[PDB]
Ligand binder design. Sequence first.
Ligand SMILES: CCCCCCCCCCCCO[C@@H]1O[C@H](CO)[C@@H](O[C@H]2O[C@H](CO)[C@@H](O)[C@H](O)[C@H]2O)[C@H](O)[C@H]1O
Ligand SMILES: CCCCCCCCCCCCO[C@@H]1O[C@H](CO)[C@@H](O[C@H]2O[C@H](CO)[C@@H](O)[C@H](O)[C@H]2O)[C@H](O)[C@H]1O
Ligand SMILES: CCCCCCCCCCCCO[C@@H]1O[C@H](CO)[C@@H](O[C@H]2O[C@H](CO)[C@@H](O)[C@H](O)[C@H]2O)[C@H](O)[C@H]1O
Ligand SMILES: CCCCCCCCCCCCO[C@@H]1O[C@H](CO)[C@@H](O[C@H]2O[C@H](CO)[C@@H](O)[C@H](O)[C@H]2O)[C@H](O)[C@H]1O
Ligand SMILES: CCCCCCCCCCCCO[C@@H]1O[C@H](CO)[C@@H](O[C@H]2O[C@H](CO)[C@@H](O)[C@H](O)[C@H]2O)[C@H](O)[C@H]1O
Ligand SMILES: CCCCCCCCCCCCO[C@@H]1O[C@H](CO)[C@@H](O[C@H]2O[C@H](CO)[C@@H](O)[C@H](O)[C@H]2O)[C@H](O)[C@H]1O
Ligand SMILES: CCCCCCCCCCCCO[C@@H]1O[C@H](CO)[C@@H](O[C@H]2O[C@H](CO)[C@@H](O)[C@H](O)[C@H]2O)[C@H](O)[C@H]1O
Ligand SMILES: CCCCCCCCCCCCO[C@@H]1O[C@H](CO)[C@@H](O[C@H]2O[C@H](CO)[C@@H](O)[C@H](O)[C@H]2O)[C@H](O)[C@H]1O
Ligand SMILES: CCCCCCCCCCCCO[C@@H]1O[C@H](CO)[C@@H](O[C@H]2O[C@H](CO)[C@@H](O)[C@H](O)[C@H]2O)[C@H](O)[C@H]1O
Ligand SMILES: CCCCCCCCCCCCO[C@@H]1O[C@H](CO)[C@@H](O[C@H]2O[C@H](CO)[C@@H](O)[C@H](O)[C@H]2O)[C@H](O)[C@H]1O
Lengths: 272, 272, 272, 272, 272
Amino acid sequence: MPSIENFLAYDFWQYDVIRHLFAFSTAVFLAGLVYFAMTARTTAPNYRLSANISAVVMVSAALELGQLWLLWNESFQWAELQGSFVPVAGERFSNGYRYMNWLIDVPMLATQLVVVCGFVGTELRNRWAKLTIAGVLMILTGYVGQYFEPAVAGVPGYEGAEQFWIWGIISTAFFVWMLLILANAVRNPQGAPSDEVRSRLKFCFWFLLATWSIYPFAYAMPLFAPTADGVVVRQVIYTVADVSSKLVFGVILSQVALRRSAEEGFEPARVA
Amino acid sequence: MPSIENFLAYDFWQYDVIRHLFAFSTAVFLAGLVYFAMTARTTAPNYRLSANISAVVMVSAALELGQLWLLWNESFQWAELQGSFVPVAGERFSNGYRYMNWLIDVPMLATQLVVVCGFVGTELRNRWAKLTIAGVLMILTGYVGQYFEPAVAGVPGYEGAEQFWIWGIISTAFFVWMLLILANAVRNPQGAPSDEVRSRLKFCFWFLLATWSIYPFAYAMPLFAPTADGVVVRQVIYTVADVSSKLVFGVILSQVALRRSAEEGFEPARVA
Amino acid sequence: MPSIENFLAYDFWQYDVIRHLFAFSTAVFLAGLVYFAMTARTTAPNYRLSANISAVVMVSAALELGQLWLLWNESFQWAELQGSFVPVAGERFSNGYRYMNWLIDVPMLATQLVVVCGFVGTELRNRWAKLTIAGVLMILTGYVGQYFEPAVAGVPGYEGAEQFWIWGIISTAFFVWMLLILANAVRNPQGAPSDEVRSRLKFCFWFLLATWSIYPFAYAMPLFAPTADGVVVRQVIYTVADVSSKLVFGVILSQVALRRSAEEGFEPARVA
Amino acid sequence: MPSIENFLAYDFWQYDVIRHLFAFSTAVFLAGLVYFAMTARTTAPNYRLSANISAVVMVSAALELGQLWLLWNESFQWAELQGSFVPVAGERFSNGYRYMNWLIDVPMLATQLVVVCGFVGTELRNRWAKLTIAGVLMILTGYVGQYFEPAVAGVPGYEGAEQFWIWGIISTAFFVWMLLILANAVRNPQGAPSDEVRSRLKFCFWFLLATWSIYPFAYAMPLFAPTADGVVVRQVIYTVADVSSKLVFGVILSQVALRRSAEEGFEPARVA
Amino acid sequence: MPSIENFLAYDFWQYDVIRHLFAFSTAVFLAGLVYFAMTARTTAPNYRLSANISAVVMVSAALELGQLWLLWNESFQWAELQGSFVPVAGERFSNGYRYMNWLIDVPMLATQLVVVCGFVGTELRNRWAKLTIAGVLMILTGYVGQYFEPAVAGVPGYEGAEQFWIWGIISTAFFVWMLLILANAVRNPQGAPSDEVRSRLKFCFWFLLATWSIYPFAYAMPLFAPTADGVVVRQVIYTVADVSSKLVFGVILSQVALRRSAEEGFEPARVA
Ligand SMILES: CCCCCCCCCCCCO[C@@H]1O[C@H](CO)[C@@H](O[C@H]2O[C@H](CO)[C@@H](O)[C@H](O)[C@H]2O)[C@H](O)[C@H]1O
Ligand SMILES: CCCCCCCCCCCCO[C@@H]1O[C@H](CO)[C@@H](O[C@H]2O[C@H](CO)[C@@H](O)[C@H](O)[C@H]2O)[C@H](O)[C@H]1O
Ligand SMILES: CCCCCCCCCCCCO[C@@H]1O[C@H](CO)[C@@H](O[C@H]2O[C@H](CO)[C@@H](O)[C@H](O)[C@H]2O)[C@H](O)[C@H]1O
Ligand SMILES: CCCCCCCCCCCCO[C@@H]1O[C@H](CO)[C@@H](O[C@H]2O[C@H](CO)[C@@H](O)[C@H](O)[C@H]2O)[C@H](O)[C@H]1O
Ligand SMILES: CCCCCCCCCCCCO[C@@H]1O[C@H](CO)[C@@H](O[C@H]2O[C@H](CO)[C@@H](O)[C@H](O)[C@H]2O)[C@H](O)[C@H]1O
Ligand SMILES: CCCCCCCCCCCCO[C@@H]1O[C@H](CO)[C@@H](O[C@H]2O[C@H](CO)[C@@H](O)[C@H](O)[C@H]2O)[C@H](O)[C@H]1O
Ligand SMILES: CCCCCCCCCCCCO[C@@H]1O[C@H](CO)[C@@H](O[C@H]2O[C@H](CO)[C@@H](O)[C@H](O)[C@H]2O)[C@H](O)[C@H]1O
Ligand SMILES: CCCCCCCCCCCCO[C@@H]1O[C@H](CO)[C@@H](O[C@H]2O[C@H](CO)[C@@H](O)[C@H](O)[C@H]2O)[C@H](O)[C@H]1O
Ligand SMILES: CCCCCCCCCCCCO[C@@H]1O[C@H](CO)[C@@H](O[C@H]2O[C@H](CO)[C@@H](O)[C@H](O)[C@H]2O)[C@H](O)[C@H]1O
Ligand SMILES: CCCCCCCCCCCCO[C@@H]1O[C@H](CO)[C@@H](O[C@H]2O[C@H](CO)[C@@H](O)[C@H](O)[C@H]2O)[C@H](O)[C@H]1O
């Protein structure tokens, strides 16, 4: 069914904040890309896969948010008599453009944590495979569920509110599985890390867990606040979650990657 | 004739999944490009042609999928009375935008496997020429056939269903020829590879064969399911096939290229 | 509410100057990006974070000004009978696209000054955190206020002029706080700088303060000149402020970064 | 006058092939650019100008074909009652967008052959000047002529068919002059080349001559086949000519540049 | 007032040449950018600022000409009954998009000549400041004047022809001042140049002066030929001037920069 945004009108500032958020996010991820590209070689070659993944995630997210920015602009138009942005006739907005890009982001972000924990070879591949299965199944079960949000929001003539619950709860199980995989990686880092590196790996885990926990809440917003203020809050928290979970996590992880690099004698990592 | 997509209406989610898939694929290939560009020099110079080809394939595929994303958006519009995305008046969608880019992708993907098998010089050129002839003829005979899919789908007022069969079967013969060329290359690698390298080359062949086999099935979909659910399934399997055959194959091949590099003493390949 | 630009008609040259300014600015920041990207490695690794931030700021600002350029073009159309550019029906212009990108620019520009002052590690992080809090709160309180500018401009049927004052004055307090943080950094540079470096750091502070002071004036323009000549002047001073505060500041800071680099023996910085 | 394409209607596949060709070509040249950019340093510095020119030509051609792709899309629209793509009211297509970019391509492609032949300094400049004069005059006399193709095609109400002949024949004279300049360069290579290098230079000349000879035929198509099948054939042969004359020529020339590099002791050229 | 182009109708070829010119120019500057970016490190670090400026100028000019290309396309549409491209209702074309980008180009092009003359440090800064003041005042006084060209062209209902004269003559004075600054730089090169380098610096000055002299003539065209043939000639001479003054000047200057580099022992400059 169409996202709940399609069933609301917006005050100038409601619509305006959302297009600002989509545009900001695109810029953050494009800037993030320039940054990670310019800083990748400072990491020792045994950790540089993580640096490289950050650049990959930035490209994905930049395009994710650019598409949303475009479609938001296309889907609503000003109506002076109503003094509102209102849906246009032949376009419908979808928040599901973000979900499909997560098939890149989620497994990649979890993999770069496993890379900095020191797993290599089959042990890296094994974890990457488990994380990609768990991550893909979490994202595809939530994508199905978010197709039922006019129904859960009680918009008249839409049924299948229970599908929203069922698919979200299944998605939550695969989320717990991913977190257990990552928790086992950071609790068992490889390559005899320092206690400072150990602490920082544990911090990266909880940062991931906290920022990733926002997404399930954004998913449930149609159920709490199916209103234009709800829609604004939802996109606000997606913006915080996106920037945190991808760019800020990339910087924090890069800092741990550099410490490990430097503790293992990489000179570029030590002179910086 | 126009593709079978032009003769159907879509439910919100049907159209929405397809635009998500096209957008996702574009992002994957653009991210793939950043990645291959950032990782090419880690391969020894005798294998770096393969690394370079991966970047070339990513550019091609990114543009292939971007065009489809654009045309999909342009070709259908929401109709609230029908609650469907429906064709617009002056635009018609074509799946044939993908075929023409395959003239780059297919021969390039098969060439980079021959490069990692160790063929150089005329033996590389000879194989590249055979593969490019076989690949170009496979793609152009299938492009002709896919112009007859309203006819094979039984859409009234379209004739030449037999052309779809004839041209697809000819295309299948050139496909078998390409596979025989590649099978002979991976069975006879050059440069005295390890048994591990030998196995991994053989795996790359079967990965290619499996992923490339999906395309003939996507071609035949108008015959099995000329419906909007069929159209969704078709674009789903194209997405799996594209990402597998190009990006995932590029990563697997890069890993064999690095092993060979390292077994031949390239230090960047050994320190990574 | 919509920005004051939406409530005015423009003479050819009024509208034309503004689209020229938006386009110029985009070009400056894109050129700035090529430049900072091509010059970053000339800085010693202990100062290269500053070089990198400049590139990040250029990307942000390029997109900031590109969005404005687009929306300006979209929001008004020529009307030969009136001989004016006049608002279009379904689009409304917003100056608030610039505010959201400042959440990147402002803290980043203040951070790169602290980097060149020599703060590292927690002392860098501590300052970055204070600056990001102070900067985010300054920008978000001013974003709220600029949603009330038809009201402060006295456009009939818009209320809440007092909100414009309240939110602007709160924003000014966080501005003073940022300046105090930076003033303490430049007065206490680290790493035993030369007196030439000391002076140049102090100059960078006052350059920042002067150029950043323009923004509060652009904010208050609806109150002084809610007219199309006022709108032109406002965008003129934003252009001066943007180019100064971001690109010219980046060059001046790079010059101090190079002096410090060279005084610490970095050869690339000495041979240049 | 408008190009002959404007005076025809297209069957789905006629229009569809042409938009596929324009899009393919854009992708080829963008991929070509990534490739030449990633491979330029493998050439010895005395031949790297040729490598660099290839990248320049790829940018030119990518934009040449992108513009055509855009204008083709804009100029015709589907008409279900006619079952044809037909001209739109306010747009007219032009094949002359390709001509103007040739002012870059033609002299640059001929110059990079002279660079690999070994001419340097004034002897390079002298040849570059003659080639640029001969090339500019060939392209501008053919551009004038192609403005008379509805007239030569016999579209009623268009006169000046003789202008098409006159300007094409003048253009052919400057073409012969260019070929004589290049033939004198490849017959008198500099720097004591191998007999293998000598042969390969001669091959590059004939490859250039053959591929460049296609263009005069595409020019004369309005005279032979002023029909929609003629228009398809013309764009097909332009595609072959463009890819051959620019990308394939770039690869072949790069291979000669590398041989010369390696025969002169450049290690990157020898290890590859 | 709107530029004189807005008051004319065009024959197919008149409009078609201008869109070809705008598109060509964009491609030249984008190719120029790839080229200067790929060749900058061949210059000794004491001259590399000039190399870097060339890349900056290419970005500026590419965007300058792209905007014009866009607006030209948007501002006029085909009218089959008139057989002309004619103005559209809600868009008006402006040649003033080029002026604002000159605020980047002009001072940057003059600065890179002063860099290759050997001025460094404050002597460079002093000249850069004088050139930027003189250049900004020349461009802004000419921008004002070009807002009066329907008046000087005698289009009925437009007054202020004298403003066109006054502002153009003031602009010419600042032009003479810039040329005197540069003439003093090339006559007093620094760093004990060769007599060959001295001659080549003098040549670069006269090349600059000749190519820059075209712009005042393009400015005065509305006064000589306020017709569609005049508009074509004007854009033709702008194209020659742009390509000469920016790209060709960049290549000639790079050649002097390399000679100086090599005469001072930079090995990359000597091996090339
Ligand atoms: C929108 C894209 C944003 C990316 C830019 C991020 C800037 C981050 C500023 C945060 C300042 C506080 O935290 C600071 O982070 C930077 C960047 O990781 C760290 O910097 C570290 O890595 C960078 C390269 O990755 C090195 O140039 C630097 O010498 C090194 O110390 C500092 O050790 C830390 O004190
Ligand atoms: C608008 C977009 C702007 C993007 C800007 C991005 C800037 C990102 C800067 C990241 C700086 C944060 O850097 C991170 O801070 C946390 C703060 O607890 C530190 O964490 C510190 O405290 C935690 C507390 O439990 C400890 O477990 C950890 O060992 C310790 O180091 C990380 O070691 C450091 O890497
Ligand atoms: C969409 C863009 C593509 C992104 C690609 C990212 C791939 C990461 C997926 C992890 C898969 C697990 O398998 C892992 O693959 C990576 C990437 O080839 C390999 O990594 C290998 O190559 C990379 C770069 O070429 C080196 O930095 C690394 O040191 C080396 O070991 C690991 O040896 C392997 O264990
Ligand atoms: C959706 C966004 C994009 C995500 C992109 C992620 C790319 C990740 C790449 C994964 C790499 C997998 O790595 C690949 O795994 C297979 C698993 O059988 C290995 O294959 C393994 O089994 C086969 C037989 O089954 C053996 O012949 C082979 O020797 C052995 O290694 C490959 O030798 C290895 O290179
Ligand atoms: C729109 C993007 C604009 C970016 C281009 C900026 C060009 C600036 C020209 C200003 C000329 C006067 O000031 C001049 O600045 C340049 C650039 O910082 C300085 O140049 C210094 O840094 C650059 C690299 O960062 C080195 O190549 C140079 O050798 C070194 O001296 C000069 O020491 C100074 O005299
Ligand atoms: C719109 C296009 C923009 C194109 C690019 C713009 C290029 C910008 C070039 C910036 C040149 C910087 O030039 C800057 O001048 C100031 C002048 O006070 C110098 O500052 C000088 O005076 C101040 C104040 O008395 C002293 O405290 C300082 O010690 C001294 O160096 C800076 O050391 C120098 O870096
Ligand atoms: C869409 C643009 C894509 C261009 C990609 C080109 C790939 C062409 C491969 C086809 C095989 C032809 O034959 C082969 O050509 C390649 C590419 O020049 C040559 O490759 C040679 O140059 C490249 C770099 O320029 C080196 O990485 C390689 O080690 C070297 O041998 C081989 O010596 C030759 O045997
Ligand atoms: C649609 C995408 C297109 C991608 C294209 C990919 C690039 C293709 C690269 C092609 C490489 C061909 O490589 C080229 O082949 C010809 C074949 O005669 C060789 O030419 C050979 O025969 C000729 C005579 O016929 C001799 O004069 C020459 O000495 C000999 O080598 C060239 O010496 C070689 O460099
Ligand atoms: C449109 C984009 C820009 C295209 C640039 C192409 C420029 C080349 C055109 C041919 C000009 C003929 O004149 C020739 O110029 C080239 C390039 O400056 C000079 O070449 C010089 O610089 C280049 C590039 O830094 C070096 O690789 C070369 O080894 C060196 O000698 C020759 O010494 C000169 O004889
Ligand atoms: C549409 C695409 C455009 C691509 C453009 C490519 C540009 C190619 C570069 C042009 C090369 C010109 O190269 C330039 O030629 C002039 C010709 O007088 C030479 O100038 C020569 O004659 C003058 C005559 O007064 C002397 O003062 C000078 O000392 C001498 O060298 C320059 O020293 C040389 O650097």
